[PDB]
Ligand SMILES: NC(=O)c1ccc[n+]([C@@H]2O[C@H](COP(=O)([O-])OP(=O)(O)OC[C@H]3O[C@@H](n4cnc5c(N)ncnc54)[C@H](OP(=O)(O)O)[C@@H]3O)[C@@H](O)[C@H]2O)c1
């Protein structure tokens with residue numbers, strides 16, 4: 001009973017699969033973040049009294065976020081890391097691997113807890129994404145496609161939008177995306193601060 005839930009990868013990347021630039025962060029998308037927060041926070045109203053989603057991220061990602069929005073409120077935060085020394089936090093968890101975090105979540109948030117898990121989201125880390133892509137529970141990717149060949153030094157590990165993977169990963173209909181995210185979501189591209197991007201949902205059979 002350690003895999004009673006599937007994982008979801010959420011990420012923003014360019015057509016060239018770039019996801020990072022020597023720390024920097026190649027683009028200004030206030031609306032994208034808004035979508036991000038909305039997707040990773042959404043939970044069925046009925047079971048909203050206790051249920052909460054989870055966000056797993058690598059150390060680098062945790063640092064990349066300003067003290068301001070740390071930790072992500074309304075969501076269970078768990079940072080993955082091996083070398084854990086003077087780890088701060090207050091309500092955040094710590095795990096040495098993707099599977100280790102899961103087992104901790106199922107033991108810390110079992111039926112004996114007043115807080116039940118709803119959806120697990122893998123939100124950050126080129127490395128964490130690597131581990132996730134190879135995971136047997138990951139069957140969904142919430143991707144934001146940035147149609148701008150900017151410069152990046154960190155890329156997504158697997159070209160799921162390319163022909164070579166077309167028999168495995170399939171892009172869902174827009175309405176299906178809106179359905180999974182519950183609330184409404186923009187169709188087509190969204191221009192913001194000189195950037196054109198779009199939201200897509202991809203899934204595969206396990
Ligand atoms: N545009 C965006 O939305 C966005 C979101 C997040 C980050 N970023 C960017 O992307 C870059 C970072 O990429 P990244 O791959 O280095 O970062 P990451 O995955 O967030 O952090 C790498 C750290 O994560 C831990 N880790 C990851 N996978 C692990 C595993 N399977 N087992 C144990 N520990 C694991 C390791 O910590 P230990 O070394 O402590 O073991 C490793 O040094 C940053 O420069 C940042 O600017 C962009």
Ligand SMILES: NC1NC(N)C2C[C@@H](CN3CCC4CCCCC43)CCC2N1
Nearest residue numbers: 010011012033036064065066123124144
């Ligand atoms: N689609 C999508 N998937 C993800 N995994 C995302 C990681 C988010 C991490 N955050 C939250 C607040 C931040 C402030 C400064 C730097 C990085 C910050 C940013 C937007 C994302 N979009």
